[PDB]
Structure 1
Amino acid sequence: EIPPLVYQLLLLSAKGSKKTVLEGIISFFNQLDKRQKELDQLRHVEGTVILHIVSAINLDQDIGEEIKHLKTEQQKDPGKALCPFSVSLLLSTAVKHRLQEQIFDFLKTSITRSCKDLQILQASKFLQDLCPQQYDVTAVILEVVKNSAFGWDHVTQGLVDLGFSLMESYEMPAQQACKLGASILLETFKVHEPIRSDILEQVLNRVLTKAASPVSHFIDLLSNIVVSAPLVLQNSSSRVTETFDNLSFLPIDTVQGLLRAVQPLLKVSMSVRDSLILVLQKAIFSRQLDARKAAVAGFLLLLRNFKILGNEAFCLEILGSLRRCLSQQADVRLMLYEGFYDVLRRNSQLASSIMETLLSQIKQYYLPQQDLLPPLKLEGCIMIFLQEPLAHLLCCIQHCLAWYKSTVGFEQNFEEMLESVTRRMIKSELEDFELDKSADFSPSSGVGVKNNIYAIQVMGICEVLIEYNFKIGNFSKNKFEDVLGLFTCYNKLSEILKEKAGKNKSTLGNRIARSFLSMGFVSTLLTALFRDNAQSHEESLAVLRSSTEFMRYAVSVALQKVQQLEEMGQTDGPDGQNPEKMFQNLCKITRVLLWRYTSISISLLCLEGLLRIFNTMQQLYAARIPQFLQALDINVTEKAAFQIRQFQRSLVNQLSSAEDDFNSKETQLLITILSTLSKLLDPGSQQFLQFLTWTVKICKENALEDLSCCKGLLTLLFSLHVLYKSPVSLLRELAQDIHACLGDIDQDVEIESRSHFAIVNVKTAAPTVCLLVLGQADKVLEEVDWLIKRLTNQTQALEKGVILQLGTLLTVFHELVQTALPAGSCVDSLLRSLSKTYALTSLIKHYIQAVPGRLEKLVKLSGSHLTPQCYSFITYVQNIHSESLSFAEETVMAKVLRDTKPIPNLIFAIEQYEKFLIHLSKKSKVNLMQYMKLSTSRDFRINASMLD
């Protein structure tokens, strides 16, 4: 009887009134759907009524504006307005060509508000506690596509338009918008057959002319949709050929990912392969740096596009292209050295030809002379400029030689000349070298930079042969001393000359320069060096362990590699793009890194690494955490609780140590390592609590005078007591200590010398803590504004928490504004934050619509705890800045209109809050001003007696 009912309703709406019919039908179908989800006969009828409503809005366009009802419902209480049928109806009407933008920006603001709300709830469980009602628009909008598998056409058009403008409006809530758009586009592509070509055309037209904003979303969702359905491009008659022009816009990573995505369709389709080979052939000899970079990037992929390792003309014809390209500049000579190994893992005789080409290349600078004066033909790499990166070429040579050796005429020659070079470097010291002067380097000089590029190039030369001798020799003492001599040449020429005269004027934040080692090699080195003691050891590591300088470099290279995995998503050396491969490498190196730390600076290096493994583990390998956690030997928390416990033991021993043994660099990393590992402890575990009570009890007892140590530890406590309870209890206690620790605003009454925390001493109550407390206080006020926004049967519960929290929050500022703060930015933060908490106005402004006793008590508290104390602060800041202004050159206009600007703003905030009390006092028929006092102002009188 529902189709006849909807028929009579739209008949009535066509001519008669149209106000409440839509609300009734949407509510009825809401309850119908909530029943149904707990099938086909319902989907068909729902599609029919959707079509009837879209026809009604098409013919009778006046039924859509009455968007106003949904907007009012959302404003009255956020969330409970985007019902699945309501959103489906507006989505269908979004393609009406009329009123699209109003509906569309309503959806945009609703979805961004919902994602921000989800972010806050994931950042605050207390809001989840008092506001369990959550409305996640992502799920309901990704459920429509699940329901759109029943012949919905205009619904699908609305979906694809919504996604297109989603990528348009992207450019973190913007990243969440990208995620939602990719999800909805993938769903509507996967299940809708006749529109998938339209989706492909839209995404192909949207990627172009888009490079300023991060556009990796286009390539990633394109890869996902083509790996789900590769035949769409051929169904679209392979419209990817026009995209080959992207070699000039931004082919730094977009081309690589695009080719990665389209790999199977290039393989199956000969026409697109021919187009790619011709476009790259015309691109390679373009003499542009960008064009050549795009060409070599495409070459890195096309060789492995075709597989024969387990059509031979295709194999042999591609050999000479990179050989010809090798003659170009060093910058374009760079990436081929790295990418050769990837394709060399995919060939047998092509590998032999590639080795022969590389051997002919290295003969250019070999100088075959049988162990005499060093083979430095670096003079050719001068055209102040550099022509060939010898270090990268040598690294590629070593890696490819290792691959060839492991796989199963010139190869014997290849090994001996490499061995000859190793025997030549050990015999060629900094006496036969041309760069024997300690200060021949000169920045911004035609010869100094020539020495600098020679200096950096030889460092990579030494590093590569370190890998060779370690790998070619197997527990053979003769090769180990060669490694010692190589680093002896390396350190003697890297520790001094460079970073003395080369570049060390600014303090080096980083360490030993960019290394050309293998993540596999460094893993083998550390695992063989530490946590390895067997009869196969030929006493070579015993003399190797004496080289503590080699020890520092041996781990600093690893810190460089995982930092590449920190800042970027990849690294150097072989197996830099196979995420499982380093995951195993990271799984292996972490233990020996931990073992070295637990064996007992040098350990400072490995511990810094562990901080960056855990950081990289969560930020990159989020889905792969359980195996890594279990690899340290299923619930992550029990193993995580074990891991922090050993770190807890290190801290408690280290913190309890004397001040002479504080090694602050260790403390910062270990504090941060907990703040990173404590992130993934699950909410429903007890170990959450005893750890949380441990850091509280360690805060109550320990009295640390370091500043960054206190700042880092407090961040951990406030990054964990933000998802379990209300932090205002902690903030109040911190404010209790700060006021007790420091003096008083009136310097007349003595605060009792309490100590809630031992960390806060006569020194740490400086901006060190007082800026963190006000930082947390600002955060609490920020979400309260959202709660006040939500407040404007569930309403009563919302008002309970807000009044309770603001009551506690007022006790925080009341005890904090009475603090005798020092000069500087800490005073400025308090004055501005006081302007924030008063903007108390919005809650008063909302309740004008209504009175409750609890709200009256808050104003009673606010009047008796904030305003009279707040004005006392202004009478004090005037003299502390007068004292601070005497220390000028011992113009000034900057320092007089910058330390006093907050004062007028604070006055305005007080009166604006005071003014809205007038409105409530008259309207609410209750006088709530007997609690507070009269407003106080100030004047002056220029002391002309002391004018001069």
Structure 2
Amino acid sequence: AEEVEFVVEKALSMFSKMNLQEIPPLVYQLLVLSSKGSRKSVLEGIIAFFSALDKQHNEEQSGDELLDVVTVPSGELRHVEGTIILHIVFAIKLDYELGRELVKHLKVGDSNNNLSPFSIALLLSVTRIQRFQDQVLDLLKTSVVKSFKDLQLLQGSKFLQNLVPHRSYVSTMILEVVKNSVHSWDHVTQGLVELGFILMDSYGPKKVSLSRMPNQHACKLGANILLETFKIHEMIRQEILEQVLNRVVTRASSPISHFLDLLSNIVMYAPLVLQSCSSKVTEAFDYLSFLPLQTVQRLLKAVQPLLKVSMSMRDCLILVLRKAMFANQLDARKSAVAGFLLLLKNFKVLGSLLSVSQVHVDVHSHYNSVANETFCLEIMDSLRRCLSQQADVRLMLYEGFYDVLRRNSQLANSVMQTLLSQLKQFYEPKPDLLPPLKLEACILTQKISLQEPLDYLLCCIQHCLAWYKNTVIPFYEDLDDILESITNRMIKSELEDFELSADFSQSTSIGIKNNICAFLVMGVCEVLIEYNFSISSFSKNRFEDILSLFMCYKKLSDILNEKATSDSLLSMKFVSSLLTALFRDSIQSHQESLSVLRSSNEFMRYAVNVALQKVQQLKETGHVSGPDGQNPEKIFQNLCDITRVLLWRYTSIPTGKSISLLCLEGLQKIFSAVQQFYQPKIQQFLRALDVSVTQRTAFQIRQFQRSLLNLLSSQEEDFNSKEALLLVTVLTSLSKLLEPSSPQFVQMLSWTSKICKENSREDALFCKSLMNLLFSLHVSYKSPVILLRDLSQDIHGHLGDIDQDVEVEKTNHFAIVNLRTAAPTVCLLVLSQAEKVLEEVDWLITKLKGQVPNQPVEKAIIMQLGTLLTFFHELVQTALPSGSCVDTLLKDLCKMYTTLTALVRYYLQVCQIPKNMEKLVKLSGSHLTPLCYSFISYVQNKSVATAMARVLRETKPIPNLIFAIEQYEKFLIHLSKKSKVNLMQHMKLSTSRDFKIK
């Protein structure tokens, strides 16, 4: 036994000296020798040796393509590592115990420095043995998730960054395992694909914060693994697409947004898709009729890059869509309309260029534009036949006709005539009959439901007509005259002509009909407001028509609101254009006409509120409802234009809610929305407001800093709490852009610290937000343990002492901490921050414990725990309220003593005791442990099945702390025995309590 170990160790040393091409023969023989003897030693030596080769090769490869010192070429290194892996996997097949040692040796929570590109690639091919498939893939899944938690924890804390040197992460290792797999690593691909889908299946979004980011990173890694494996390996790309389409083509309505993005990325390599995995796309097309409308629209958009270059896929889709439309079954014609819309919204050229014994013939006929027009008109005529269907189909067509008419300018006449014919069914041509719209024909009675979205029909007509007059000009006059007639008769209507307050009930039939008719009138008024703004340019007469239309819109809105919603029909481009003229227009001619609109404060509120809706839709859904609402470049341009107006109005003139306050709300929403979606365009976003990102952000930050000072300079009763809360939220979001290693960040932290130290507000919510901003800035700068200690003293001074015979001196470090906010606002906030400090220290101790730089880390750990001891020392003798403050402090003391136990257990492994560790032990025994017993006594002495659960739940915390202290003292006895220094001389005898009933 020992002889086998000795000879194996000798051969391990010979690895370095001998040639690499002789390694695979040696490993195969060494694995056979391993069977009758040591198994872990052989595997450890091979893995460690090849990991060093990988690391050395990576360093020498990184650099210019000039003369490099290349000890091993990349081509032969991957070939050698590949055949070593196959030998190990084949050995595991005939030796089950060899496989168990490999999993045990590479078992992960710790970083597991043993993991490497070679060891990860070894595990992926081991999955070809079904006996090890699940546990190996589970080992890899836990490794990447834990690795991302390490990355998240390091990024958020400056204290850890100064201590922990950067180490490679499992996510990076696996990505280059895929990259290295191009050297004929076909045995790794099978387990590579399964690992990618496990990451996506287990950590995909479940929309149906601490863990969401590592889950999102883990899910994104699976998409990267699958996408890169698709490009390189041809024998596996067919399986990848089939599994992706399986997850996407379903009626389950599960969140599949991440799978749809992977499908879109895969189909960007259309020749790769068409070559091998071509039938799967067509089979998914066959199931489009059975799928729901929302799935069809998202699936067809995902495979749009494939249909853009390929005619066969486009031709097959047209055949499926034509068959689905002719099908008598419903919910399939809706998908056919959606499919035909998407094809006609995106492609100007539609069309092409069997039985057992029937074959296709390659006819060499030149492309015919005239035949293409008839092909498009045939689909356009079919879509016109779908305008008499349910209101769901009508809504889709009205949204699609604008993009269809912009794409195919040759379909403009067909679309416009179709829109005109539909409008004639609901328009009264009589010059004096009121109302001009038949709102009773839009209602289908069989239960009352909406049949025709008349408001959406005019929105499509107005936008299509607007495109017509500025794209093809350089029936249209008939449409221009109808809209003017509609506008005049809607204004002169007295709201009684629409049969509208009569019932407005949410249950009765007449109330449902009245409620729907109320929405249509408001929707029509919005569209006519948009129409009259553009037509006749800036004329006073037309703007008076807009104001008259708005009053009709607002009066009906007030009636529905008080007796009690829907999206606005204004395009985001118009809202941006309306706001700019309504607030930032100084042209002499326009001022006369704009004074009509500006005089109505309710109109001012309406214009800003609709802009807030557009931003809110972007945050919720990722796109805006109106025209061009799914174009990221045009949404961003409107975001910049709206932001400029909102910035100007708020700052130039200070202060339902006021207009300036509403602009502040829109600014906060935009800043959050821009960072969430247009992350790479932040420099362009900040540029368009009127140096680098940090310099421009600091200019805006200082601009909002002055605003907050003005409210704080006001009186306590006059304090505008709503505005101050918004300013801190804006400052918090903007401060995410500053670089922490910059003077601009230091100024932001210094300003926040000064505001907290000097301003005393009675608003608990304002204090909580301000402290959260201060702690967010501070943690990325340095350890907040000194900040935490000073805040605990303020809570002690304001709330007094539990002794009731001593007087605690009021430090007054921070004025924001007053008698009202000291608890439960500040106390709960500082306890949550000390929790994060302990999690950081617990992470360090775990790394050191598995590691065996130690002396610098050990001193910093003791320094953190030493300062955090004084923070807890102040809180354990404070007369906290009996609510969640006591519950959280008791739970946090248990975490403090658990962390102390982990530090002591670390020295048990290392000390075969330094002064700093001894002084920490002495401090814990003189300033925390005796006072913990006093606090426990203080808490207990002073004072259906739901109550039964509550009383039994309250019996948990105090015994949990008692176990934590006794567990801590148990291991200090072990350390004193092992290190021969008595650490229990600093600890007094434990104090026990007994119950006695009066």
Provide the TM-score with structure 1 as the length reference: 0.92
Post-superposition shift, 1:803? 2.0
Corresponding residue for 1:204? 245
Post-superposition shift, 1:931? 1.9
2 CA distance for matches of 1:295 and 1:795? 67
Alignment CA distance shift 1:443-1:262 (3 Å): closer
Corresponding residue for 2:395? 334
Q: How many residue pairs align between the two structures?
A: 923
After superposition, residues 41-120 of structure 1 pair within 5 angstroms as: 41-59=73-91, 61=93, 62=95, 65=98, 68=101, 72=105, 78-120=111-153
Corresponding residue for 1:34? 55
- Do residues 478 (structure 1) and 478 (structure 2) align? no
Post-superposition shift, 1:271? 4.2
Alignment CA distance shift 1:720-1:229 (3 Å): farther
After superposition, residues 451-490 of structure 1 pair within 5 angstroms as: 451-490=514-553
2 CA distance for matches of 1:9 and 1:397? 76
Alignment CA distance shift 1:549-1:42 (3 Å): closer
Corresponding residue for 1:885? none
SS in 2 for 1:704: coil
- Do residues 141 (structure 1) and 196 (structure 2) align? no
- Do residues 702 (structure 1) and 702 (structure 2) align? no
Corresponding residue for 2:41? 20
Post-superposition shift, 1:342? 1.8
Question: Identity, % of aligned pairs?
Answer: 67
SS in 2 for 1:385: strand
- Do residues 446 (structure 1) and 503 (structure 2) align? no
- Do residues 607 (structure 1) and 671 (structure 2) align? no
Alignment CA distance shift 1:913-1:596 (3 Å): same
Partner AA of 1:831 in structure 2: L
Partner AA of 1:373 in structure 2: L
Partner AA of 1:300 in structure 2: L
Corresponding residue for 2:626? 573
Post-superposition shift, 1:128? 1.7
- Name which of 757, 765, 769 aligns with 2:814: 757
- Name which of 955, 970, 983 aligns with 1:915: 970
After superposition, residues 198-597 of structure 1 pair within 5 angstroms as: 198-208=239-249, 211=252, 213-244=254-285, 247=288, 251=292, 253-284=294-325, 291=332, 294-308=335-349, 311-380=372-441, 381-383=443-445, 384-408=448-472, 410-437=475-502, 440-495=503-558, 497-501=559-563, 503=564, 514-537=567-590, 539-597=592-650
After superposition, residues 457-856 of structure 1 pair within 5 angstroms as: 457-495=520-558, 497-501=559-563, 503=564, 514-537=567-590, 539-600=592-653, 601-633=658-690, 635-792=692-849, 794-839=853-898, 840-851=900-911, 852-853=913-914, 854-856=916-918
Post-superposition shift, 1:639? 1.0
Contact conserved, 1:626 with 1:636, CA < 8 A, in 2?
Answer: yes
Partner AA of 1:341 in structure 2: Y
Q: Pick which of 244-253 and 334-343 moved more.
A: 244-253
1 CA distance for matches of 2:520 and 2:959? 61
SS in 2 for 1:537: helix
Corresponding residue for 1:507? none
Partner AA of 1:878 in structure 2: Q
Post-superposition shift, 1:701? 0.9
1 CA distance for matches of 2:109 and 2:821? 46
Q: Pick which of 916-925 and 517-526 moved more.
A: 916-925
Q: Pick which of 424-433 and 476-485 moved more.
A: 424-433
2 CA distance for matches of 1:67 and 1:43? 31
- Do residues 11 (structure 1) and 76 (structure 2) align? no
Alignment CA distance shift 1:129-1:541 (3 Å): same
SS in 2 for 1:466: helix
Q: Deviations over 1:226-250 (max 9, x none)?
A: 2134442343233212113554786
Partner AA of 2:527 in structure 1: V
2 CA distance for matches of 1:150 and 1:645? 55
Partner AA of 1:630 in structure 2: R
Partner AA of 2:489 in structure 1: R
Contact conserved, 1:197 with 1:236, CA < 8 A, in 2?
Answer: yes
Alignment CA distance shift 1:602-1:797 (3 Å): same
Partner AA of 1:312 in structure 2: E
Post-superposition shift, 1:620? 0.7
Q: Deviations over 1:564-622 (max 9, x none)?
A: 00111011111111101011111111111111112210011111101111100111111
Alignment CA distance shift 1:863-1:165 (3 Å): same
Post-superposition shift, 1:213? 4.8
Q: RCO higher in 1 or 2 (8 Å CA, sep ≥ 6)?
A: 1
2 CA distance for matches of 1:34 and 1:538? 71
- Do residues 870 (structure 1) and 932 (structure 2) align? yes
Post-superposition shift, 1:91? 2.6
Post-superposition shift, 1:758? 0.6
Contact conserved, 1:114 with 1:135, CA < 8 A, in 2?
Answer: no
CA RMSD of aligned residues (A): 2.8
Q: Pick which of 160-169 and 735-744 moved more.
A: 160-169
Contact conserved, 1:74 with 1:81, CA < 8 A, in 2?
Answer: no
Q: Deviations over 1:360-381 (max 9, x none)?
A: 1122211222133213422231
Alignment CA distance shift 1:56-1:66 (3 Å): closer
Contact conserved, 1:74 with 1:80, CA < 8 A, in 2?
Answer: no
2 CA distance for matches of 1:753 and 1:867? 24
SS in 1 for 2:962: helix
Corresponding residue for 2:66? none
Post-superposition shift, 1:407? 1.4
Alignment CA distance shift 1:316-1:786 (3 Å): same
SS in 1 for 2:560: coil
Contact conserved, 1:710 with 1:759, CA < 8 A, in 2?
Answer: yes
Corresponding residue for 2:357? none
Post-superposition shift, 1:542? 1.5
Post-superposition shift, 1:71? 5.0
Alignment CA distance shift 1:683-1:190 (3 Å): farther
Q: Deviations over 1:604-643 (max 9, x none)?
A: 1111101111100111111111111111145211111111
Partner AA of 1:668 in structure 2: L
Q: Pick which of 578-587 and 894-903 moved more.
A: 894-903
Q: Deviations over 1:164-201 (max 9, x none)?
A: 33333335222111111111222222233454344334
Contact conserved, 2:873 with 2:927, CA < 8 A, in 1?
Answer: yes
Contact conserved, 1:593 with 1:606, CA < 8 A, in 2?
Answer: yes
2 CA distance for matches of 1:133 and 1:306? 50
Q: Pick which of 219-228 and 35-44 moved more.
A: 35-44
Post-superposition shift, 1:54? 1.0
Q: Deviations over 1:841-881 (max 9, x none)?
A: 3333343334523333322222222222122222222344x
Contact conserved, 2:289 with 2:324, CA < 8 A, in 1?
Answer: no
Structure 1 gap ranges (5+): 504-511, 883-887, 944-948
Q: Pick which of 790-799 and 342-351 moved more.
A: 790-799
2 CA distance for matches of 1:735 and 1:287? 73
Corresponding residue for 1:508? none
Q: Pick which of 160-169 and 386-395 moved more.
A: 160-169
Q: Deviations over 1:473-492 (max 9, x none)?
A: 20111101000101111122
Contact conserved, 1:329 with 1:387, CA < 8 A, in 2?
Answer: yes
Post-superposition shift, 1:111? 1.1
Alignment CA distance shift 1:213-1:376 (3 Å): closer
Post-superposition shift, 1:650? 1.3
